[PDB]
Amino acid sequence: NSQLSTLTISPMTYLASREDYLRLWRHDALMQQQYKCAAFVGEKVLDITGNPNDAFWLAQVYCCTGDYARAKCLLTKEDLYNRSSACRYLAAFCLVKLYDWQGALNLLGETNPFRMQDGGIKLEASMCYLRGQVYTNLSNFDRAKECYKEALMVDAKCYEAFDQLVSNHLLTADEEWDLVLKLNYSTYSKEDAAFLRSLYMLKLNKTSHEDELRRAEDYLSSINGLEKSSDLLLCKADTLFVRSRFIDVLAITTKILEIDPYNLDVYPLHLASLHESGEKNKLYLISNDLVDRHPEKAVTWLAVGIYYLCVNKISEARRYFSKSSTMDPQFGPAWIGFAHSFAIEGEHDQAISAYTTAARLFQGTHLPYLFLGMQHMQLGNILLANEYLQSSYALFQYDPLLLNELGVVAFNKSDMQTAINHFQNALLLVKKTQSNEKPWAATWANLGHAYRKLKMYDAAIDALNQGLLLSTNDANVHTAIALVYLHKKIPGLAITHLHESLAISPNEIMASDLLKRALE
């Protein structure tokens, strides 16, 4: 009963009478969105027959018209919901559309009442999903999680549930894998179980189960036609983004945007990769037609924000990540953008709020702990900053930014040797990726600072220099270079570099002093 779907009630089962001409007619009206007609015919068949299935289909028409109270009433009148699972599903569905949360729960039950197959989603699944939707609106996110997990266990085809779990981040990276691994794919097709399971795995954490994920990606690429699938190209792009292969991410992500211009899931990856390469023009064009055509979508304002961010207008960037994360509080990318705005302004505490609310929406990934670490370095909590940094490292060990941060920490303790090893490995890492080379001047100079500490002045000069290279105008690395030169006891070279510093910033207190002493 609740083990079947609407397929069982389709008039088209006749393929396997006046009421039968009426039903065929009502059905096609619905399908053709001629709703005045489907209500007209549907009302006449129900008047004749009094069949629950006819009440259901008539109710359907009203729902397509947004007359939810009306469908609700029709399905309530005769106590239909008691005699039909479809009618129970649909009455509950209308109740939810009406925001009647206790009503819907009276009809569904606070937990699954039901503790063969026609091709559709088991109505038992659909009602647990519905129960999940209610619990979300009562903010019992724990019962919503369970009550949505149940839908999926009941019928692997209930992807509205999966999409809720994954989109509302109700699960940890681990929980998500254990869920799809333990699902009963025979409710899709015993013989083609691997196809659906591989599809689901593509939605999941890219890093933790690299192996199950690589054969799923291989299996699906061997299926003719899927190589052009947006969902498949997105495991890849995200995987490529983790490895910091940003040009690769753009090749893929731009191709998705031409063959499917209304695909919106592609934007966070696309936007973030454009910001990394500093493409104002491209960011500007995108944000503008997004606000033109999707002003009501949170992604739209993520894009406006990221743009104000290759352009260094931090106030208006903050505004827009604010607007987007408010429009969709579950939208992780907007929170990261939000936190970065605070970090740049020096608003450490607010940056830490935003990064911690973001670590919820990106659980099982190493970047939020990375950022929490970097921000706690600013405050001077090295113990804390190190906690968070060891934490990202346990999740993912091959990101140049993380090795740099671990290196700034070893240097802040006095472990120059370890600092040098970490910096040298960031640099090695960066050579394999496709990252904008300019920001890594800080790592080079970092390696140079570790070297002067170990009084290896020539290795320091060479590294400081390579730092200076990647950043045309830095007063602090010129001062650094001078400090080294007068350690080498060559004040004359120390003098010309101090003149550069004081030119980039004539006020610096320490550059003036280092010049004071370099009189020789």
Binding site: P400, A442, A480
Partner: peptide
């Protein structure tokens, strides 16, 4: 996820003092 730039170690006022002790 947007990224950010690596943290930069800076020469500090304390570094110029670690130098003065060249005696």
């Amino acid at each position: 996820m947007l990224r950010r730039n690596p943290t930069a170690i800076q020469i500090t006022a304390e570094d110029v003092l670690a130098y003065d002790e060249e005696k």
